[PDB]
């Protein structure tokens, strides 16, 4: 399953001018575009090397879309102050994420479009793409308004059409890197805790995509209950890294193995401290 997703953030800054608006585009988990209203030259730009086929008109068009949206988000933040009777004095945030997940049949699997005010659900487009869920009484005003205006239909048309067409195109264009699989470079380290115990750490670096399985075992038995894990983290170069650790008795390290599995392998890799 693949997706095209856009993320918008507007942050008000009283006494400092208009809100800053930032829009970021994602194909699957890869950031591929960015617009920042605060940039010396506020323009939508590629954040990836494989978007070079698009013309100047492409980025010009996106830029104007985001500029128009920035204006809307400013209005949204002002309106929210009224709805919630809040002061013009404080900073507030308004966020949107929307996009399309496509099934192997090449058609929309799930379209979504959600909004948040100050980091909490405000209003969202339901899965049927024909109705809204309002999170509170303020958002119920918006719901009434968007229902009267027939907003849902236009969003559904986008999610089912342009969004899907775009994903198809970008996936095709970024194919060589988006769909690649770089296997992890994995190894085991050994760190004494005390006289009785030591830490065995199973490392995996430089892998893509980010999904990976690291499983400590004791004489063949799955020990995925006593492992210490870190959340998979970005290497900074587009790859990911992660480790899984187990505390074992000193002198019994040889009884344990780390099983590493990832798309870029073929079959599991079995590692051990020796």
């Amino acid at each position: 399953s693949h997706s095209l997703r856009y993320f918008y953030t507007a942050v008000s800054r009283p006494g400092l001018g208009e809100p800053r608006f930032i829009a970021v585009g994602y194909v699957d988990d890869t950031q591929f575009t960015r617009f920042d209203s605060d940039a010396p030259n506020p323009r939508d730009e590629p954040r990836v090397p494989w978007m070079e086929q698009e013309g100047p008109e492409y980025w010009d068009r996106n830029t104007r879309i985001y500029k128009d949206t920035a204006q809307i988000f400013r209005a949204n933040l002002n309106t929210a102050l009224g709805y919630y009777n809040q002061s013009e004095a404080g900073s507030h945030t308004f966020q949107e994420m929307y996009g399309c997940y496509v099934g192997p049949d090449g058609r929309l699997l799930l379209g979504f479009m959600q909004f948040a005010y100050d980091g909490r659900d405000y209003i969202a487009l339901n899965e049927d793409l024909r109705s809204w869920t309002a999170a509170d009484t303020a958002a119920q005003i918006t719901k009434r308004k968007w229902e009267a205006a027939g907003e849902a239909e236009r969003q559904r048309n986008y999610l089912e059409g342009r969004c899907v067409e775009g994903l198809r195109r970008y996936l095709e264009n970024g194919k060589d890197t988006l769909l690649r699989a770089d296997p992890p470079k994995a190894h085991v380290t050994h760190h004494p805790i005390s006289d009785r115990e030591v830490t065995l750490r199973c490392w995996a670096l430089g892998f893509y995509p980010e999904e990976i399985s690291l499983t400590w075992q004791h004489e063949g038995e799955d020990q995925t209950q006593d492992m210490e894990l870190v959340e998979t983290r970005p290497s900074g170069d587009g790859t990911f890294q992660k480790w899984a650790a187990l505390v074992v008795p000193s002198g019994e390290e040889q009884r344990y193995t780390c099983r590493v599995q990832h798309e870029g392998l073929q079959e599991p890799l079995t590692l051990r401290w020796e």
Binding site: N62, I65, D68, Q71, E96, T142, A149, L159
Partner: peptide, 9 residues
């Protein structure tokens, strides 16, 4: 390509 901005809230 992004969608055109949704109606104001």
């Amino acid at each position: 390509i992004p969608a055109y901005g949704v109606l104001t809230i």
